[PDB]
Amino acid sequence: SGFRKMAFPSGKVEGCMVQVTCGTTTLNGLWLDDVVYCPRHVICTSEDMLNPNYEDLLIRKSNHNFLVQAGNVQLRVIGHSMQNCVLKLKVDTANPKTPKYKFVRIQPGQTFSVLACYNGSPSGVYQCAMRPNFTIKGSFLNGSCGSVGFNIDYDCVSFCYMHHMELPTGVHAGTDLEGNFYGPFVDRQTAQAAGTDTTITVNVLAWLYAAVINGDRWFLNRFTTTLNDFNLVAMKYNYEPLTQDHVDILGPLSAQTGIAVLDMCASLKELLQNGMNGRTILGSALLEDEFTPFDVVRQC
């Protein structure tokens, strides 16, 4: 037993991180098949980021301006194009370590694993959630740019996130591997607002279920509730409102624990209306939202 915030094993993706250097900028790229994916602001200087025009600046770049380095060996670049905010560098060799992979755009509230890198080398791996405002709360020092996040299913790596930039509020932002940003952000160094960060209600429910599985039961009050009353209480407290789909997804956990979903909603409402009084749940003094229902089932 016990319950940890695990991340997927990272060996398949480590096999794929390279370093891309253009002009005086250096960040990390993703070498899959005979293509390398990286953020396009690899081509920008620092004064460039204040207001960059990417077609204009890309037009003063040719194939030999880009240094792709994998471990100690240099990749030969034989084509370059820009798909939204990712640059794609066609190189002359396939990655012999390319896994079975896919590019998927996740939805808010789902989770993934980030492999944090600097200079094409990994330094760490951690599990994080796509916030409802499409930012994430990561760990990214300079040169982390181009780090990717991913899920693994059996043998197949679904890439879902590539890091682009840190907002002036310390949260981070990025794109799918087709270059479209998660959220209303742009790759420009200007003041950009993230909206209200709400809590991923269904995840919190899944975690309370994980808590019951592992013996932590003290929050299980004697009430029940309705979906409407619960959304009332959720919206007062900046909680993403609960839908019958959410209730369905928690079916497995419901049946395993013998606790109806709406009874769980009653207990969660009570926790929202009265704090935790100093008790913990699974060793946390606050309500966790970075585990999906699928996360909880996989671990348990």
Catalytic residue annotation:
41, 145
8 Å CB contact between 63 and 91: no
1: its two tokens: 């037993």
Partner residues linked to 68 by β-bridges: 20, 75
Largest CA distance in the chain: 69
Q: Which residues pair with 70 in a beta bridge?
A: 73
Cα 55 to Cα 209: distance, rounded to the nearest angstrom:
50
- Do residues 56 and 48 lie in contact, with contact meaning Cβ atoms separated by under 8 Å? no
The DSSP output letter for 128 is E
- The amino acid at residue 292 is T
Q: Which residue type occupies 180?
A: N
Whether 250 contacts 205, CB under 8 Å = yes
Give the residue ranges of DSSP H helices in 214-278. Answer: 227-236, 244-249, 251-257, 261-274
